[PDB]
Write a protein that binds this ligand. Structure first.
Ligand SMILES: NC(=O)c1ccc[n+]([C@@H]2O[C@H](COP(=O)([O-])OP(=O)(O)OC[C@H]3O[C@@H](n4cnc5c(N)ncnc54)[C@H](OP(=O)(O)O)[C@@H]3O)[C@@H](O)[C@H]2O)c1
Ligand SMILES: COc1ccc2c(c1)c(CC(=O)O)c(C)n2C(=O)c1ccc(Cl)cc1
Length: 316
């Protein structure tokens, strides 16, 4: 047994997810070892994506811990994500099947539209022209959602959702004539310096779960993150609350999310910290502590993907 939340399609999502993205210069082998350790530590939710270029390794970890008798496939909740070069409806299923082939799994638990801006089809995840301009594409995301809906009916994705969507883009889907399946979730940046209260309230009102990424203040990887942004985990209120609970600022930041009804991801390729992060189920924060963490909020968005700014669907 482990702590899960019922999703709006009646499937269940473990409330603590293991993030698998590392910058490109971390060797891909380390994804294989970290996922296994994560499973061993008690993570039942594993978050990946096509664009992370680690689905072979993360799929191997998963198949390995199933085959060795440590866990059943039914007790692993695996997420993949549809990259922006496969938004065209006819390219949706093939992208999911490519992911499944790379993973050697029969199905994904959750398939998300990764980012609402589209780019030109082909093998390249960031297609550029000769002068280095990104090759944007024009795709109706409602059609992409219909093709997502079909992957669910094919049983290739048990649930479907979205990531990096804003209010307008969510509403666009929710109001679609003939809508068959709401997004079960909206995976977005969420932490004590960017707490997403408004967007969180909105998703609650539609029974969409907010899934928090960069919950620990991000991989901080340049140039995607401004090195002058403050380091979340160095916050004195978070460090004071850690100290007081004999926990860590990480655990405080994760517990905060669980208690406000957010599903929280946490990446780590360090054995010690992987095991530490599951301790988020061993303590609780009082109302006064929670309000304290609320007060940290400051509109610090770490991650903007601003190479994809300009088109109308850019969400930020
Ligand atoms: N949908 C999207 O567009 C999107 C965007 C970004 C991220 N994601 C997902 O969300 C996941 C997590 O986000 P993220 O990678 O930005 O990083 P994150 O979880 O905020 O973690 C940031 C850093 O914290 C360190 N860390 C982990 N546990 C710690 C602990 N207990 N104490 C101190 N440091 C700790 C990690 O380093 P060590 O590895 O050395 O421990 C990691 O680099 C990603 O891997 C991916 O699955 C989704
Ligand atoms: C919303 O702000 C960002 C900023 C940078 C991002 C992402 C999201 C994501 C999406 C995510 O992490 O889920 C990725 C993968 N980013 C990259 O750094 C990146 C690295 C290599 C390639 Cl080939 C393509 C993108």
């Amino acid at each position: 047994k482990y702590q899960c939340v019922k999703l709006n399609d009646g499937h269940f999502m473990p409330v603590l997810g293991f993030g698998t993205y590392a910058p490109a210069e971390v060797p891909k082998s380390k994804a294989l070892e970290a996922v296994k350790l994560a499973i061993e530590a008690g993570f039942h939710h594993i978050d990946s994506a096509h664009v992370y270029n680690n689905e072979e390794q993360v799929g191997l970890a998963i198949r390995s811990k199933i085959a060795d008798g440590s866990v059943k496939r039914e007790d692993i909740f695996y997420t993949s994500k549809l990259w922006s070069n496969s938004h065209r409806p006819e390219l949706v299923r093939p992208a999911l099947e490519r992911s499944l082939k790379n993973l050697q799994l029969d199905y994904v638990d959750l398939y998300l539209i990764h980012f609402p801006v589209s780019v030109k089809p082909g093998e390249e995840v960031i297609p550029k022209d000769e002068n280095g301009k990104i090759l944007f594409d024009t795709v109706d995301l409602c059609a992409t959602w219909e093709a997502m809906e079909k992957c669910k009916d094919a049983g290739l994705a048990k649930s479907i959702g979205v990531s990096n969507f804003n209010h307008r883009l969510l509403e666009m889907i929710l109001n679609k004539p003939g809508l068959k399946y709401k997004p079960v979730c909206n995976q977005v940046e969420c932490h004590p310096y960017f707490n997403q209260r408004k967007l969180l309230d909105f998703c609650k009102s539609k029974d969409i779960v907010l899934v928090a990424y960069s919950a620990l203040g991000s991989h901080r990887e340049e140039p995607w993150v401004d090195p002058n942004s403050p380091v979340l985990l160095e916050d004195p209120v978070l460090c004071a609350l850690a100290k007081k609970h004999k926990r860590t600022p990480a655990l405080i930041a994760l517990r905060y999310q669980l208690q406000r009804g957010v599903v929280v991801l946490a990446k780590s390729y360090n054995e010690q910290r992987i095991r530490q992060n599951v301790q988020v189920f061993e303590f609780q924060l009082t109302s006064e502590e929670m309000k304290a963490i609320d007060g940290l909020n400051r509109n610090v968005r770490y991650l903007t993907l601003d190479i994809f700014a300009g088109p109308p669907n850019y969400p930020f």
